[PDB]
A = this chain, B = another copy of it.
Amino acid sequence: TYEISSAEWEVMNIIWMKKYASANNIIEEIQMQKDWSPKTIRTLITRLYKKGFIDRKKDNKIFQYYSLVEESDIKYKTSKNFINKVYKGGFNSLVLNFVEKEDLSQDEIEELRNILNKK
Q: Which of A73, A92, A95 has the largest count of B CB atoms less than 10 A from its CB?
A: A95
8 A Cβ contacts from A67-112 to B: 72-73, 75-76, 78-79, 82, 85-88, 91-92, 94-102, 104, 108-109, 111-112
- Size of the A side of the interface (Cβ < 8 Å), in residues, is 35
Q: Which residues of A contact B (CB under 8 A)?
A: 6, 9, 13, 17, 72-73, 75-76, 78-79, 82, 85-88, 91-92, 94-102, 104, 108-109, 111-113, 115-116, 119
| Cβ contacts A to B, 29 pairs, < 8 Å | A6-B85, A9-B85, A9-B86, A72-B100, A73-B101, A75-B86, A75-B87, A75-B94, A76-B97, A76-B101, A76-B102, A79-B82, A79-B97, A82-B82, A91-B102, A92-B111, A92-B112, A92-B115, A95-B95, A95-B112, A95-B115, A95-B116, A99-B116, A99-B119, A109-B116, A109-B119, A112-B116, A113-B116, A116-B116
